[PDB]
Curated annotation (Swiss-Prot), chain A:
GO biological process entries: nucleolar large rRNA transcription by RNA polymerase I; ribosome biogenesis; RNA-templated transcription; termination of RNA polymerase I transcription; termination of RNA polymerase III transcription; transcription by RNA polymerase I; transcription by RNA polymerase II; transcription by RNA polymerase III
GO molecular function, one term: zinc ion binding
Lineage top rank: taxon: Eukaryota
Record's miscellaneous remark: Present with 5300 molecules/cell in log phase SD medium.
Keywords: DNA-directed RNA polymerase, Isopeptide bond, Metal-binding, Nucleus, Ribosome biogenesis, Transcription, Ubl conjugation, Zinc
Lineage: Eukaryota, Fungi, Dikarya, Ascomycota, Saccharomycotina
Name listed for the protein in its UniProt record: DNA-directed RNA polymerases I, II, and III subunit RPABC5
Subcellular location: Nucleus, Nucleolus
Function: DNA-dependent RNA polymerases catalyze the transcription of DNA into RNA using the four ribonucleoside triphosphates as substrates. Common component of RNA polymerases I, II and III which synthesize ribosomal RNA precursors, mRNA precursors and many functional non-coding RNAs, and a small RNAs, such as 5S rRNA and tRNAs, respectively. Pol II is the central component of the basal RNA polymerase II transcription machinery. Pols are composed of mobile elements that move relative to each other. In Pol II, RBP10 is part of the core element with the central large cleft.
Swiss-Prot record, chain E:
UniProt-annotated binding residues for Mg(2+): D4
Locations listed in the record: Nucleus
Protein name (Swiss-Prot/TrEMBL): DNA-directed RNA polymerase II subunit RPB2
Assembly and interaction partners: Component of the RNA polymerase II (Pol II) complex consisting of 12 subunits.
Residues of the full protein shown: 834 to 882 of 1224
Domain of life: Eukaryota
Family label: Belongs to the RNA polymerase beta chain family.
Note: The binding of ribonucleoside triphosphate to the RNA polymerase II transcribing complex probably involves a two-step mechanism. The initial binding seems to occur at the entry (E) site and involves a magnesium ion coordinated by three conserved aspartate residues of the two largest RNA Pol II subunits.
UniProt organism field: Saccharomyces cerevisiae (strain ATCC 204508 / S288c)
Encoding gene, per UniProt annotation: RPB2
UniProt function note: DNA-dependent RNA polymerase catalyzes the transcription of DNA into RNA using the four ribonucleoside triphosphates as substrates. Second largest component of RNA polymerases II which synthesizes mRNA precursors and many functional non-coding RNAs. Proposed to contribute to the polymerase catalytic activity and forms the polymerase active center together with the largest subunit. Pol II is the central component of the basal RNA polymerase II transcription machinery.
UniProtKB/Swiss-Prot annotation, chain F:
Other facts: Present with 6750 molecules/cell in log phase SD medium.
Residue ranges of the region described as Disordered: 44-72
Subcellular location: Nucleus
Name by which UniProt lists this protein: Transcription initiation factor IIB
Gene designation: SUA7
Organism: Saccharomyces cerevisiae (strain ATCC 204508 / S288c) (Baker's yeast)
Superkingdom of origin: Eukaryota
Key word Disulfide bond present: no
UniProtKB/Swiss-Prot annotation, chain H:
Native source organism of the sequence: Saccharomyces cerevisiae (strain ATCC 204508 / S288c) (Baker's yeast)
Note: The binding of ribonucleoside triphosphate to the RNA polymerase II transcribing complex probably involves a two-step mechanism. The initial binding seems to occur at the entry (E) site and involves a magnesium ion coordinated by three conserved aspartate residues of the two largest RNA Pol II subunits. Present with 18700 molecules/cell in log phase SD medium.
Family: Belongs to the RNA polymerase beta chain family.
Subunit-structure text: Component of the RNA polymerase II (Pol II) complex consisting of 12 subunits.
Name by which UniProt lists this protein: DNA-directed RNA polymerase II subunit RPB2
Gene name as annotated: RPB2
């Protein structure tokens, strides 16, 4: 259900880091700790942000009308 | 309402937000915890009944 | 519980057939003063008969059930102390895999 | 399997410990009072004491259990053959009563064994096993069964629950079709199949139970258990 | 936060923390009460209603 | 109601349900203090209660239009009940069943109920067929029309209104229909307003 | 007692018919009408009574009358108390047993416990509670919405006169 | 004693995902089409 | 200024339950009444006492 723009706790814009994240994991095949770091997610609040996102939107898009 | 102290008269303070706010030292007789508990208010309609409240 | 499931019910009829073909003296002509220790056989709480060598029969039953040949849903217990051998085809029994 | 003729038999041991003459009696259905064990055995063709004793007690050297049974023999002394025993049981509901006794024992007594004929020998043996088991707990050899052991408990699911409902609902239809057969044979009106079978019987019948929760007929929805069938919780996937 | 309550970050609430969607469904039948009587979906007029 | 204070022809008066008053919107005067929740009141007659536990469920609904004014209570087996009395009392009710020629013509409804369930027809259709029949059966306009075809004609009258589609040939086969007879009986009833 | 309670009055002959406020009716939508269980039960007493009257008036067949009598005895009895030991129950078509007069007074929720010893009231409010270390002991915080709904009827005196006008 | 079809009896309600149900043998892509949740 | 005590700080999965205050808040100073007893009606929904 779509990557939140901005970390709840701190406010670092996080919604622009999604597709980029998924590229590091799949295309580059880097582990999550390594991936989130490349993206610039220093503090655990921002990490919890990307690390824990469940992109349900993708499941929803599967229904036609 | 298990004993006389489960029903006590209070001084109003009209405040923002949807909750009844109370002092903590008053939690003890009511057997209240702020884990989603609810409480009741009763408004006296007489100058006589408000004295019974404020006085006893 | 997670692994848990319930019985749906089997036909006891074929299990009863294997019993009489595995050395089961039928209750109808049992003589108690002659075999006072012979282990009593039960199928869904029905005393069908009696058995002289209970251990071998039990072994045959279990290795039949682990083979699929007799339903894995069927219950099979020997009570060495009470000299009893009860079986259940019964539905409603709660079971877990081990 | 089928109908579930849920009838209960109690084999009661009378008298407390340290009390004179401790008799053993049984709860036979459609009969007013409980009947002494020996009278039931004699009603099953097992007439001498030596035989009535053999069905109950397997060891001839178990004087402890045999002395426990001595007052049961003495209590049923008056009865001494099938007819006397059967007439005895019947009066507790001549010829009218002998048949009643013959029927109760064959039809309503230990029916999980068999509902008919030649299995007297079998029904009788089970009776002995029950008494044996009873006397064991009374001699403190074996202990009272755990009324909470999960293995002696069953869980009736969607299948059994519907099966129970449908059995009563099919019997409702079957007997309404019979009623019609009489109506149409009386006037030779031709037994119109659509006029005989009322779809609504089963259709709305099952629909009720499943909708309201009262597992039974609407008649009836007062005496029938409610709680089976609830609106599915859709709070969270886990719920 | 004493006695089982708790302080929450209002700023996190804004950033979307613990927000929820709520959907309620209202249902109505246009019922028929025999040969002549029938309920009707329309904008009722205060003078004749 | 109408406001005494003002009185303009169309009385613009509001029901302030939550505050429990009937008020004059124009002047503000509350015209009534006592106000009832109708929906919650109706729920004491018609309810989820079949068990008889509910202290709220105190009444029972009826259909005046069809049942008329017949208020009756089943004598039935309760928790403690000797079957002897249930039989005795119901045996007694049988002797007291000396009902009229029309209080026995409610058995013609029992026919329509048996005919609708057989025609896989809804509850509303029955309540319409039982309605049209209860109004035309005594009629002079109908007179000595084939009684078997008069009630089958009211089933089509019920089906036409409840929008439940059924052919004349369908109802014809359902009971037994003399085509010209059940077409004439369906027209005298249709003419009966 | 010679004045208020004689043994003869333990046997009923003349039946007080309660007014509708005791047994309410609801005329819904001209094909839907709701009548109180007590009204049903009285219609049974009357139907039974009317029948026995005709039976006694006409050729009294003894056993046919004592039959009709015990039926009247029931309906009358069953209207005051439906939960009688040994007797079958008066049932409303639904399978629901008739809410007798005894039934209504009876329990906790009954006219005594639930309607007199206790009762829901007006000028009352309920919401969630939270603690405020900034409030005084004797004080209670009231959400504005509640305060705006709950009321005090202050009487106009030459003291409050100007302030009350301002509130109005 | 000497000598001289298929009838509808009622509607049984089906349990979703059972042998008789339309969704038993249904695929992921199929259910999504049926507006049902996999 | 530093807090004299050090705090146990870190993530913890928390669930937003049902029961929100505005679904519970209830006030009444007169309103609808029962026809049998003439006492107030039951339920927040029904605007009862
Ligand atoms: Mg508390
Ligand atoms: Mg506490
Ligand atoms: Zn952050
Ligand atoms: Zn006005």
């Amino acid at each position: 259900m779509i990557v939140p723009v901005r970390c709840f706790s701190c406010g670092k814009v996080v919604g622009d880091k999604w597709e980029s994240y998924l590229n590091l994991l799949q295309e580059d095949e880097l582990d999550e700790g390594t991936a989130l770091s490349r993206l610039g997610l220093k503090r655990y609040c921002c990490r919890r942000m990307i690390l824990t996102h469940v992109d349900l939107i993708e499941k929803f898009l599967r229904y036609n009308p | 309402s298990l004993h006389k102290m489960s029903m006590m008269a209070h001084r109003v303070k009209v405040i923002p937000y949807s909750t009844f706010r109370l002092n903590l030292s008053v939690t003890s007789p009511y057997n209240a915890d702020f884990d989603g508990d609810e409480m009741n208010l009763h408004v006296p309609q007489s100058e006589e009944t408000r004295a019974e409240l404020s006085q006893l | 519980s997670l692994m848990s499931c319930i019985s749906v019910g089997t036909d006891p009829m074929p299990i009863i057939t294997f019993l009489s073909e595995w050395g089961m003296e039928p209750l109808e002509d049992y003589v108690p003063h002659q075999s006072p220790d012979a282990t009593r056989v039960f199928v869904n709480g029905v005393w069908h008969g009696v058995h002289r060598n209970p251990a071998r029969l039990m072994e045959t039953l279990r290795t039949l059930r682990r083979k699929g040949d007799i339903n894995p849903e069927v219950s099979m217990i020997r009570d060495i102390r009470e000299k009893e051998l009860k079986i259940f085809t019964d539905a409603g029994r709660v079971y877990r895999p081990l | 399997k089928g109908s579930r003729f849920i009838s209960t038999l109690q084999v009661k041991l009378y008298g407390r410990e340290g009390s004179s003459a401790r008799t053993i009696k049984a709860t036979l259905p459609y009969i007013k009072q409980d009947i002494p064990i020996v009278i039931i055995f004699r009603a099953l063709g097992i007439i001498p004491d030596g035989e009535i004793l053999e069905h109950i007690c397997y060891d001839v050297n178990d004087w402890q259990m045999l002395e426990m049974l001595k007052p049961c023999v003495e209590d049923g002394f008056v009865i001494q053959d099938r007819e006397t025993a059967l007439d005895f049981i019947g009066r507790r509901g001549k010829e009218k009563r002998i048949q009643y006794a013959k029927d109760i024992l064959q039809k309503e007594f230990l029916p999980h064994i068999t509902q008919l004929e030649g299995f007297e020998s079998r029904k009788a043996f089970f009776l002995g096993y029950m008494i044996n088991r009873l006397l064991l707990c009374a001699l403190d050899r074996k202990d009272q069964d755990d009324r909470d052991h999960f293995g002696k408990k069953r869980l009736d699911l969607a299948g059994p629950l519907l099966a129970q409902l449908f059995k009563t609902l099919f019997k409702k239809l079957t007997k309404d079709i019979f009623r019609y057969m009489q109506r149409t044979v009386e006037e030779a009106h031709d037994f119109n199949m659509k006029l005989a079978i009322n779809a609504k019987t089963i259709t709305s019948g099952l629909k009720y139970a499943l909708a309201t929760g009262n597992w039974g007929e609407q008649k009836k929805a007062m005496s029938s258990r409610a709680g089976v069938s609830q609106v599915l919780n859709r709070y969270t996937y886990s719920s | 936060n004493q006695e089982d309550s708790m302080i929450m970050n209002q700023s996190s609430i804004d950033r979307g923390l613990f927000r929820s969607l709520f959907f309620r469904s209202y249902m109505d039948q246009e019922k028929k009460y025999g040969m002549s009587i029938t309920e009707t979906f329309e904008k009722p007029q205060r003078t004749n209603t | 109601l109408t406001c005494p204070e003002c009185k303009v022809y169309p009385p613009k008066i509001v029901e302030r349900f939550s505050e429990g008053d009937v008020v004059c919107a124009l002047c503000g005067l509350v015209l009534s203090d006592k106000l009832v929740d109708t929906r919650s009141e109706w729920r004491t007659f018609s309810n989820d209660d079949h068990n008889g536990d509910d202290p709220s469920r105190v009444g029972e609904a009826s259909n005046p239009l069809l049942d008329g004014n017949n208020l009756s209570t089943r004598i039935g087996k309760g928790e403690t009940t000797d079957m002897r009395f249930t039989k005795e009392l119901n045996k007694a009710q049988g002797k007291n069943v000396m009902d009229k020629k029309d209080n026995e013509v409610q058995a013609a409804f029992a026919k329509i109920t048996m005919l609708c369930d057989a025609a896989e027809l809804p509850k509303i259709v029955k309540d319409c067929a039982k309605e049209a029949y209860k109004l035309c059966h005594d009629e002079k306009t109908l007179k000595g029309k084939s009684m078997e075809s008069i009630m089958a004609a009211s089933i089509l009258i019920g089906c036409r209104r409840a929008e439940v589609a059924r052919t004349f040939k369908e109802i014809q086969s359902l009971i037994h229909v003399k085509t010209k007879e059940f077409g004439k009986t369906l027209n005298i009833m249709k003419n009966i307003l | 007692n010679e004045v208020f309670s004689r043994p003869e009055w333990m046997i009923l002959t003349c039946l007080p018919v309660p007014p509708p406020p005791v047994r309410p009716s609801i005329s819904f939508n001209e094909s839907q009408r709701g009548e109180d269980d007590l009204t049903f039960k009285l219609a049974d007493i009357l139907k039974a009574n009317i029948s026995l009257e005709t039976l006694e008036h006409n050729g009294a067949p003894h056993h046919a009358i004592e039959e009709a009598e015990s039926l009247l005895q029931f309906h009358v009895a069953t209207y005051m108390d439906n939960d009688i030991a040994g007797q079958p129950q008066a049932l409303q078509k639904s399978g629901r047993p008739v809410k007798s007069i005894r039934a209504r007074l009876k329990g906790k929720e009954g006219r005594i416990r639930g309607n007199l010893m206790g009762k829901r009231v007006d000028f009352s409010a309920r919401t969630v509670i939270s603690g405020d270390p900034n409030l005084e002991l004797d004080q209670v915080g009231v959400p504005k919405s509640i305060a705006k709904t709950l009321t005090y009827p202050e009487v106009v005196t030459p003291y409050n006169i100007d302030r009350l006008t301002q509130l109005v | 004693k000497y000598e001289l079809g298929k009838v509808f009896i009622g509607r049984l309600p089906i349990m979703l995902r059972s042998k008789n149900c339309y969704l038993s043998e249904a695929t992921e892509s199929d259910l999504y089409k049926l507006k049902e949740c996999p | 200024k530093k807090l004299m005590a050090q705090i146990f700080f870190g993530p913890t999965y928390y669930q937003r339950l049902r029961h929100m205050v505005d679904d519970k808040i209830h006030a009444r100073a007169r309103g609808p009444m029962q026809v049998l007893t003439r006492q107030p009606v039951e339920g927040r929904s029904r605007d009862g006492g």
